[PDB]
Amino acid sequence: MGFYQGPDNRKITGGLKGKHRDKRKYEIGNPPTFTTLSAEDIRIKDRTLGGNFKVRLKYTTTANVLDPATNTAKKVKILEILETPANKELARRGIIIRGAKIRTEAGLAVVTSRPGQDGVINAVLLKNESQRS
Secondary structure, three states, rough: OOOOOOOOOOOOOOOOOOOOOOOOOOOOOOOOOOOOHHHHHEEEHHHHHOOOOOOOOOOOOOEEEEEEEOOOOEEEEEEEEOOOOHHHHHOOOOOOOOOOEEEEEOOOOEEEEEEEEEEEEEEEOOOOOOOOO
8 A cells, every 4th residue: 555566568579580582492394205106006907908708600500411422411501492391481590391492502402301409401412403393
């Protein structure tokens, strides 16, 4: 009870600290080179490509002329039927009936059998031109 000094407060300013200036560290510079290709490699599989398959021989329409003079049966190509059978329109296709005249690379022959599995109709040479009258 008389006199007493009150709470004296001062400003303790001790923030005397500077920062630093920043430079480059170790940043990624140049990128690496690239790969080439495999185009020519695929072109080497492309160059060695195979050829093409060939053709086959087929069954030509034949008449099996037994030649009575030589007594030997032969396969000669069919020209045409001359003496018209009842089944002429079928004999055009080559379905000829026994007794109808036909021309072969041999001569005039008469069909003496039915059409074979080859489409080969057996015939016999009459050893002359049979007069159609």
